[PDB]
Amino acid sequence: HSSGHIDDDDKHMAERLSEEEIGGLKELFKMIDTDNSGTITFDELKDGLKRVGSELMESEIKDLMDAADIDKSGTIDYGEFIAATVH
Ligand SMILES: [Ca+2]
Ligand SMILES: [Ca+2]
């Protein structure tokens, strides 16, 4: 409840990007987190492609998890994966 940010589109231009994870935190992020708590962890990460039982190797889940979440917080966020710049 405020009126110092919700008024002109000028302030909406600086609040249209996802800094932490608010971007997908609603639709995608939740649908990704097997916990739906708002935070994904390797242990849960694998459960994504694991339950798929296709032809993947959990070995890539750890090399992908580490490369994804650079915050080394042990937990990956929507804003931690997007950090990927200059590819
Ligand atoms: Ca979780
Ligand atoms: Ca993190």
Curated annotation (Swiss-Prot):
Organism of derivation: Glycine max (Soybean)
Tissue specificity as recorded in UniProt: Found throughout the plant.
Domain EF-hand, residue spans: 20-55, 56-87
Binding site for Ca(2+) 2: D69, D71, S73, T75, E80
Residues of the full protein shown: 329 to 402 of 508
Function according to Swiss-Prot or TrEMBL: May play a role in signal transduction pathways that involve calcium as a second messenger.
Binding site residues for Ca(2+) 1: D33, D35, S37, T39, E44
Notes on the domains: There are 3 contiguous domains conserved in the CDPK subfamily: a kinase domain, an autoinhibitory (junction) domain and a calmodulin-like domain. The autoinhibitory domain (298-328) inactivates kinase activity under calcium-free conditions.
Coiled coil: none
Similarity comment: family membership: Belongs to the protein kinase superfamily. Ser/Thr protein kinase family. CDPK subfamily.
Protein name: Calcium-dependent protein kinase SK5
